[PDB]
Design a binder for these strands. Structure first.
Lengths: 87, 97, 129, 206, 121, 81, 216, 25, 96
RNA sequence: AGGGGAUCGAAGAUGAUCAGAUACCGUCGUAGUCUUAACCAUAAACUAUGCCGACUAGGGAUCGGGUGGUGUUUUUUUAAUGACCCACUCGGCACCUUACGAGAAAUCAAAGUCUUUGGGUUCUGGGGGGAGUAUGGUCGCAAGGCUGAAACUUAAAGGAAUU
RNA sequence: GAUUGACCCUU
């Protein structure tokens, strides 16, 4: 958020969980950042380019992190036939 | 404070259970709360088995055993060490040894 | 028995939101529920929702996002005047810059800021933020 | 986006079926595991080998992405996975912890066994619940070889496989090591298979 | 009163780990080398250290000893654990699978040898 | 779970659920046209009869009521409807 | 002089990380107070109170002192430390270490009209420890810090200028009151708002980008 | 004193008071 | 439903319940019963004059043993007897 | 009140240990314990947890039903009316490991969805005692039950066992 | 499962 004259204030806009879109605390030490490398028609990992996900400690401790990562991977295309929307 | 979630007995959905008399002191205790044990023992104390076998008329005798159920009130069971005071965490062990 | 259908809907939405689920099922889909969900939709608090038509009363499947903090209902539906709108907003909203006290007025169901822009008042329903 | 050459090859499916990876837990089945497929009579469930391979390649992609190859840490405490993770650490960087995982290794910076990883590969969450619980303190992503009845709490990515078969655990670790090397590019033979035998990660009692 | 103090036990273990081949199973030679191979402030303490050292050599001479690992032991265990027999355990030994395994592979879309076995109950 | 399609659930799970716990509740009962051997006497009977249903022709009761489904007579041909 | 033992500590010593907002953004676990005192040299530490705690033994009572201290710089960042030690000075120092370790950022907001710099908190917030529940309410400019002295000092060290407070329970338990108020000001950056609704790209972690400058 | 015995003693006092008042009236 | 009625027409129930539960307060009950004007020694007044009467064999509380005097006083408006404490050192000169 | 009255047994008789023992322990033993009409209306009458409705990690099990699986026995191993075994809905008595959460904690899938405070509704409490007393009603044959205070006194009394 | 009843002073 900013004041009237532009001038973005409250620096450190925080991250949001990529599964439940809730703010990740400063001391939410059960939250993680998964990095998944991409391959480009060569079978090898291009350094410096990964698809990143922020998974919240809430879902990690709930046990839904595997399902959430499957859904995110299949939605972003780097997974094929693991996650099914219709249960 | 509530020591046990079972209230020291086994009664959920009853309200009342007919009582039983203790085998040692004849104290009235609810049947579900008792420390009932089953005593199944040889009649010949397992020591005079040789003597009974040699003095028996009938060979290959079955040598029956006696069966009874001893209902202990909590006080008498603790005193006679049928059960004993356990640590708080392992009071929840429903499993006999 | 089932007294406040809107309260049951809002409570189900809140529980699903807190659990993290991206969708919630609601029974039995009142018109007041539809209007409340339309207000949340307009202000971006839920997303989409579907009206399943069983012939009895209808169900609603609401796609949630991470944005809803707390949707609630004020029971009874207190009579609220122009003077009382500020009272209620300062009572049950996190701040004065976001969140809406929703009320059924003579011009249909709306939030408090649109009620002020239309200069109308009515009976308080609930709140979202 | 996969280039459609990573998928389950018949030779890999043969390896997995020989290792009996597809055999899961009994009728006990945690709801957080949709990897099951057509629960077979007698009560033994069938693990879907296609998605076990897909999760294997996803985990390998994560281990390839994470840049320093030694911060990756492979946890095992079961009697079967210890040699599997030792050979995994002999193949790639992947500093291992076999046998006892001392408490306060991810925390407790003054410990001798103190590591500060960026990814932990756990052989079995139920056996290594200590390592996962500690990783939850220091933001360590968790890959775990997860059977259909394993405790999927605090696990980031789970590989659906058999935790009871030594062949299963050994072959899963073999696939993980082979593929992490494949994506890293050390094993140039993209089409040719690996020379190291799938039975190399096999525990011997005597 | 035969239990050794932690200092004696740990000193004996440290001696064994880094001088396993240099010393033998005889107490007399063990002490006559220990007096110069480790600096001790007591003749009796040297005697205790060498006696426990001899006991651990007797323990290793029949079976491995836990907590102690030296260069020769580590070499032999790495050789044993990198050993592998040429005949594989995953080759054709005749594959017993069920109808569910069979149509699993069919639904995945692959072909490989297998045997047809009825579902047990 | 966290994300799932309640709007379009799988038919397996929907059939597994209780008849009133589905998206749109529908009867799990059905009807059947029953024909006794010999005379065709085509009559339609409800599965959960609660009635010793018979035609007015003769003593040819076709079902015996039970707790749920009606157990049809030994010699009877049913056709799902 | 320092010789840190942590990847984050070594990077901070090497100067790779310039501000504590990166640590707060990536939620790294901080285990060294040197990290905090290098990232924020404007931080002021003063003890909130000392109380004696006794433990009975077969020979008398063993008395230690519990020190409750609050560390914080004039705007944005504050932590709260509690330590029980045999001597008062040792308890004070260790409490300073813990309060520096537990430093968190504060979401300062406007009561309205967003004219100047942020003065109050963005949202009504609440913390709980024990029975003490402390509730922070945004206040208009010029209101001041309407609070009891213990929580008022914590808010002053946090950096808010004008805020109402309301406490429920045994507020006389100073440690629980301060912990509840600390939780209340910690939840401010966790409350989600429409200005925070926008989706952000998830940058690489500082440790991930700067792993290449390790020992080997 | 055990509360049951205190209650019994209070009952005895109450009935003695009742008897005395009945005699007076 | 948190106990209390919440209906829009439950105002009578809420008022009556509050009226009934006010009586549990010590000061409200005294105020509404007029215990100051019926049984308080001062008749609900801040101060009261009296005539000091005699000496009584009373003993102080913990910790002491002091039996010299504590003024028994007969009030003028009520005629009731109350024991008052002479509030300073040297009480002897004023209790003639 | 009338029946009944074996046993056990407030009272009591009585032997013992005891400083004392009109207590514990021993043997008797009226009332009672059992019924029939009429009263009584209390209990740690307890889950110390009001009722109705909704929603929130997961399970080994169990009782009443019990969508289904060309899965076993006497009869005919080659139609059939058993019962068990496994998916598994529904309604019950309950249980099993952090906390999503709650709580002062013990602990609690409710004691959760309560300072992010409103689903409906009934009852009750407002520091300890005096006191469940006095008094007035009211019911009761009585014992007593229900309603039910003040004067006065008091700085604690209490709730979880942390060493 | 006997008889072991009692013990005036402060945080």
């Amino acid at each position: 958020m900013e004041n009237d004259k532009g001038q973005l204030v409250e620096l450190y806009v925080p991250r949001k969980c990529s599964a439940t879109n809730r703010i990740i605390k400063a001391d939410d030490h059960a939250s993680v950042q998964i990095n998944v490398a991409k391959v480009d028609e060569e079978g090898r990992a291009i350094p410096g380019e990964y698809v990143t996900y922020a998974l919240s400690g809430y879902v990690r401790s709930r046990g839904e992190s595997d399902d959430s990562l499957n859904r995110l991977a299949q939605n972003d295309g780097l997974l094929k036939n693991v996650w099914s929307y219709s249960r | 404070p509530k020591k046990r979630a079972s209230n020291g007995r086994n009664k959920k959905g009853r309200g009342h259970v007919k009582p039983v008399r203790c085998v040692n002191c004849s104290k009235s205790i609810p049947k579900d709360k008792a420390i009932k044990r089953m005593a199944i023992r040889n009649i010949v104390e397992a020591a005079a088995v040789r003597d009974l076998s040699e003095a028996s008329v009938y060979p290959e005798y079955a040598l029956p055993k006696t069966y009874n159920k001893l209902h202990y009130c909590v006080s008498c069971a603790i005193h006679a060490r049928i059960v004993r005071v356990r640590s708080r965490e392992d009071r929840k062990n429903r499993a006999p040894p | 028995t089932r007294s406040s259908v809107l309260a049951d809907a809002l409570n189900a939405i809140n529980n699903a939101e807190k659990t993290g689920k991206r969708q919630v099922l609601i029974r039995p889909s009142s018109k007041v529920i539809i209007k409340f969900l339309q207000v949340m939709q307009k202000h971006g608090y839920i997303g989409e929702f579907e009206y399943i038509d069983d012939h009895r009363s209808g169900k609603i499947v609401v796609q949630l996002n991470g944005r809803l903090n707390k949707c609630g209902v004020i029971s009874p539906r207190f009579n609220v005047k122009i003077g009382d709108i500020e009272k209620w907003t300062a009572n049950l909203l996190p701040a004065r810059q976001f969140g809406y006290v929703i009320l059924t007025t003579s011009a249909g169901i709306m939030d408090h800021e649109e009620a002020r822009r239309k200069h109308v008042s009515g009976k308080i329903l609930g709140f979202v933020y | 986006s996969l280039p459609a050459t990573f998928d389950l090859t018949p030779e890999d499916a043969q390896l997995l079926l020989a290792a009996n990876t597809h055999l899961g837990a009994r009728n006990v089945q945690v709801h957080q595991e949709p990897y099951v497929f057509n629960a077979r009579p007698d009560g033994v469930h069938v693990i879907n080998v296609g998605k076990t391979w897909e999760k294997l390649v996803l985990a390998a992609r994560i281990i390839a992405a994470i840049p320093n190859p030694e911060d990756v840490v492979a946890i095992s405490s079961r009697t079967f996975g210890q040699r599997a993770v030792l050979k995994f650490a002999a193949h790639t960087g992947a500093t291992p912890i076999a046998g006892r995982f001392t408490p306060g290794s991810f925390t407790n910076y003054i410990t001798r066994s103190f590591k500060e990883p960026r990814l932990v590969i756990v052989t079995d969450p139920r056996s290594d619940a200590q390592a996962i619980k500690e990783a939850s303190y220091v933001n360590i992503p968790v890959i775990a070889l997860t059977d259909l009845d394993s405790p999927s709490e605090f696990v980031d990515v789970a590989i659906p496989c058999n935790n009871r078969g030594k062949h299963s655990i050994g072959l899963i670790w073999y696939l993980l090591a082979r593929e992490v090397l494949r994506l890293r590019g050390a094993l140039v033979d993209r089409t040719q298979p690996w020379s190291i035998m799938p039975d190399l990660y096999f525990y011997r009692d005597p | 009163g035969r239990v050794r103090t932690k200092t004696v036990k740990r000193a004996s273990k440290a001696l064994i780990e880094r001088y396993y081949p240099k010393l033998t199973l005889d107490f007399q030679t063990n002490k006559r080398l220990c007096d110069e191979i480790a600096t001790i402030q007591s003749k009796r303490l040297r005697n205790k250290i060498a006696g426990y050292t001899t006991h651990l050599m007797k323990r290793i001479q029949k079976g491995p000893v836990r907590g102690i690992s030296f260069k020769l032991q580590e070499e032999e265990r790495e050789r044993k654990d990198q050993y592998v027999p040429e005949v594989s355990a995953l080759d054709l030994s005749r594959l017993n699978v069920d109808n569910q395994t069979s149509d699993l592979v069919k639904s995945l879309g692959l072909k490989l040898p297998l045997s047809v076995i009825n579902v047990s109950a | 779970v966290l994300v799932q399609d309640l709007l379009h659930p799988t038919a397996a799970s929907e059939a597994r659920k209780h008849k009133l716990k589905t998206l749109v509740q529908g009867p799990r009962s059905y009807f059947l046209d029953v024909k006794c051997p010999g005379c065709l006497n085509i009559t339609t009977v409800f599965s959960h009869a609660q009635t010793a249903v018979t035609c007015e022709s003769c003593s040819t009761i076709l079902c015996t009521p039970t707790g749920g489904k009606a157990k049809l007579s030994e010699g009877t041909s049913f056709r799902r409807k | 002089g320092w010789v840190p033992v942590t990847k984050l500590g070594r990077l901070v010593k090497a100067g790779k990380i310039t501000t504590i907002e990166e640590i707060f953004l990536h939620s790294l676990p901080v285990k060294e107070f040197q990290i905090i005192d290098t990232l924020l040299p404007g931080l002021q530490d003063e003890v909130m109170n000392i109380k004696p705690v006794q433990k009975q033994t077969r020979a008398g009572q063993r008395t230690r002192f519990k020190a409750v201290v609050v560390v914080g710089d004039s705007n944005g960042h504050v932590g709260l430390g509690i330590k029980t030690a045999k001597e008062v000075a040792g308890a004070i120092r260790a409490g300073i270490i813990i309060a520096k370790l537990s430093v968190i950022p504060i979401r300062r907001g406007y009561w309205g009209t967003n004219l100047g710099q942020p003065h109050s908190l963005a949202t009504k917030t609440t913390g709980k420890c024990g029975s003490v529940t402390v509730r922070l309410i945004p206040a208009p400019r010029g209101s001041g810090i309407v609070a009891s002295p213990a929580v008022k000092k914590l808010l002053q060290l946090a950096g808010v200028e004008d805020v109402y407070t309301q406490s429920n329970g045994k507020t006389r338990t100073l440690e629980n009151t301060l912990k509840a108020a600390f939780v209340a000001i910690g939840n401010t950056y966790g409350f989600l708002t429409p200005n925070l609704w926008a989706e952000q790209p998830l940058p690489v972690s500082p440790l991930d980008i700067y792993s290449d400058e390790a020992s080997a | 004193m055990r509360a049951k015995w205190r209650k019994k003693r209070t009952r005895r006092l109450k009935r003695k008071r009742r008897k005395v008042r009945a005699r007076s009236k | 439903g948190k106990g209390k009625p919440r209906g829009l027409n439950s105002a009578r129930k809420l008022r009556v319940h509050r009226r009934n539960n006010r009586w549990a307060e010590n000061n409200y009950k005294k105020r509404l019963l007029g215990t100051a004007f019926k049984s308080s020694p001062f008749g609900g007044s801040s101060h009261a004059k009296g005539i000091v009467l005699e000496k009584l064999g009373i003993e102080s509380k913990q910790p002491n043993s002091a039996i010299r005097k504590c003024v028994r006083v007969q009030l003028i408006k009520n005629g009731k007897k109350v024991t008052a404490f002479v509030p300073n050192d040297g009480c002897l000169n004023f209790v003639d």
